[PDB]
Design a binder for this molecule. Structure first.
Ligand SMILES: CC(C)[C@H](N)C(=O)O
Ligand SMILES: CC(C)[C@H](N)C(=O)O
Lengths: 90, 90
């Protein structure tokens, strides 16, 4: 159903616009997002919750090509992490 | 120091690109992001952690104008919410 993408990116302006822009240009909806800075660095962590799609693998390719994306992978996180976060903020 | 912006937006493709694009186009960095869909609706809640700035007023003005942004407000969330989230996901 859904899948979680984990990105390590540079914490500088415009990075999230590039990443989400790849989905926007494909009418691909992003269901959940978490972005947290990494202490003592110039980078941030991004979690993207998206519907599992045949187009996903070619998109991971496009994300990795972005200069400000250091790494992009799948399903390393708690698959229900956004449900647990929502319990405390919704 | 920093402030948290709360947005209610439609859960449609491209919406996060529009919101962050406003910051990107002004070289305004977004430090933390949380996006959660709202149960039983076509809307999502976005929390944006950004440096408190006089530029924010105009920025908030532009965010509210976006058709897909239903509402946008300041200082209604726990200012340290992204520190608390990091305790459990970093
Ligand atoms: C990491 C990301 C959210 C970046 N800080 C940006 O403003 O686009
Ligand atoms: C709410 C937001 C993340 C929207 N679903 C988007 O894909 O841009």
């Amino acid at each position: 159903d859904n899948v979680i993408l984990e990105l390590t990116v540079r914490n500088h302006p415009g990075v999230m616009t590039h990443v989400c822009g790849l989905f926007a240009r494909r009418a691909f909806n992003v269901e959940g997002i978490l972005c947290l800075p990494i202490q003592d660095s110039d980078k941030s962590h991004i979690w993207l919750l998206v519907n599992d799609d045949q187009r996903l693998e070619q998109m991971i390719s496009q994300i990795d090509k972005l200069e400000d994306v250091v790494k992009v992978q799948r399903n390393q996180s708690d698959p229900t992490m956004f449900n647990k976060i929502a319990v405390f903020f919704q």
